[PDB]
């Protein structure tokens, strides 16, 4: 009955893993050689990455 005014702190811990961002047009693994890796945009040109 004497509970203080309390606020929720949220977080997560995700050990042992690497934050994978796949270079795929739908972020899915449809093969080891992805569809954007075979795309003619990235295969016939040079692009900067920032």
């Amino acid at each position: 009955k004497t509970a203080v005014d309390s606020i929720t702190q949220k977080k997560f811990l995700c050990d042992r893993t690497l934050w994978r961002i796949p270079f795929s047009s739908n972020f899915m693994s449809m093969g080891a050689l992805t569809d954007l890796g075979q795309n003619l945009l990235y295969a016939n040109s040079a692009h900067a990455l920032d």
Partner: protein, 50 residues
């Protein structure tokens, strides 16, 4: 006209290019860009400005 005039794909009208290499001097200032025109695109240099 509805055919063979304007694309129906994702394509940016105006791009914004960050300098690849800036170079400041006491009397001048040098900016180096990569004005990359992608696949199946034409760029009139009149539309380009700094």
């Amino acid at each position: 006209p509805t055919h063979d005039v304007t694309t129906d794909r994702s394509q940016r009208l105006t791009l914004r290019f960050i300098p690849v290499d800036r170079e400041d001097t006491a009397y001048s200032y040098k900016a180096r860009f990569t004005l990359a025109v992608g696949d199946n695109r034409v760029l009139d240099m009149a539309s380009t400005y700094f």
